Amino acid sequence: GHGDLHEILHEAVPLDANEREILELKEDAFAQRRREIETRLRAANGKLADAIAKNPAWSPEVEAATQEVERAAGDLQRATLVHVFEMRAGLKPEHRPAFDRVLIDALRRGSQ
């Protein structure tokens, strides 16, 4: 699948009042990081489209654009999962098992 793992967690197992206060800095830093990597992904998609518009074949331009797309997609996947673990660190310990249930099930479905 193509689930939004971060959104799934904040909606299904929302932070409590104190957890939200504790996590606010890291949540903002993540929002900014997600936006930056998504800007890079959109730009890489544009480069791949441009390459194929110019010459619709495998090509050095296509090879480079494909790699750039892959790299940005991987950076987003990894950054998201690191932030998911940041969230888990900021939870009261007793809230972690419910969080994990949602996380495990969503990962199995391909959410990222």
Give the residues lining the site for a second copy (CB under 8 A).
2, 41-42, 45-46, 48-49, 52-53, 56-58, 62, 66, 69-70, 73-74, 77-78, 81-82, 85, 88, 96, 100, 103-105, 107-110
Cα separation, 62 vs 84, in Å, equals: 33
According to the binding rule CB under 5 A, does residue 112 interact with K ion?
A: yes
Residues 14, 56, 60, 93: which binds Cl ion (CB under 5 A)? Answer: 14
Q: What angle do CA 64, 79, 2 make, to 5 degrees?
A: 75
Scanning the structure block, which residue is given the tokens 């390459």? Answer: 51
**CB of 18 or CB of 77, closer to a second copy:** 77
Site for K ion in 68-97 (CB under 5 A): 81
Question: What is the nearest approach in angstroms of a second copy to the Cβ of residue 75?
Answer: 10
- Write the CB contacts of 80 (distance below 8 Å, at least 6 apart in sequence): 5, 6, 34, 112
Cα separation, 55 vs 33, in Å, equals: 33
Question: What is the nearest approach in angstroms of a second copy to the Cβ of residue 105?
Answer: 8
Q: What is the CA radius of gyration of the chain?
A: 17
